[PDB]
Design a protein around this motif. Sequence first.
Motif, PDB file in Angstrom:
ATOM      1  N   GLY A   4       0.837  -1.172   0.000  1.00  0.00           N
ATOM      2  CA  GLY A   4       0.000   0.000   0.000  1.00  0.00           C
ATOM      3  C   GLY A   4       0.870   1.218   0.000  1.00  0.00           C
ATOM      4  N   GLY A   5       1.733   1.344  -1.034  1.00  0.00           N
ATOM      5  CA  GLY A   5       2.671   2.425  -1.141  1.00  0.00           C
ATOM      6  C   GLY A   5       2.721   2.895  -2.554  1.00  0.00           C
ATOM      7  N   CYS A  13       9.374  -7.575  -4.180  1.00  0.00           N
ATOM      8  CA  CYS A  13       9.111  -7.686  -2.768  1.00  0.00           C
ATOM      9  C   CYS A  13       7.815  -6.980  -2.474  1.00  0.00           C
ATOM     10  N   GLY A  14       7.801  -5.640  -2.633  1.00  0.00           N
ATOM     11  CA  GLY A  14       6.612  -4.874  -2.382  1.00  0.00           C
ATOM     12  C   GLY A  14       6.901  -3.453  -2.728  1.00  0.00           C
ATOM     13  N   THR A  15       6.030  -2.531  -2.254  1.00  0.00           N
ATOM     14  CA  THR A  15       6.087  -1.135  -2.485  1.00  0.00           C
ATOM     15  C   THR A  15       6.942  -0.499  -1.415  1.00  0.00           C
TER      16      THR A  15
END
Length: 20
Positions: A4-5, A13-15
Motif C-alpha cells: 500500500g505504497g 518484494c513490495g512497495t
Amino acid sequence: CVWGGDCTDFLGCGTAWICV
C-alpha cells in the motif's frame, strides 16, 4: 517491502511509502 505504497522498496518484494 511494505504494501500500500507509492513507490518500490525492492522490486518483486513490495512497495515503499517515501522514496527519494
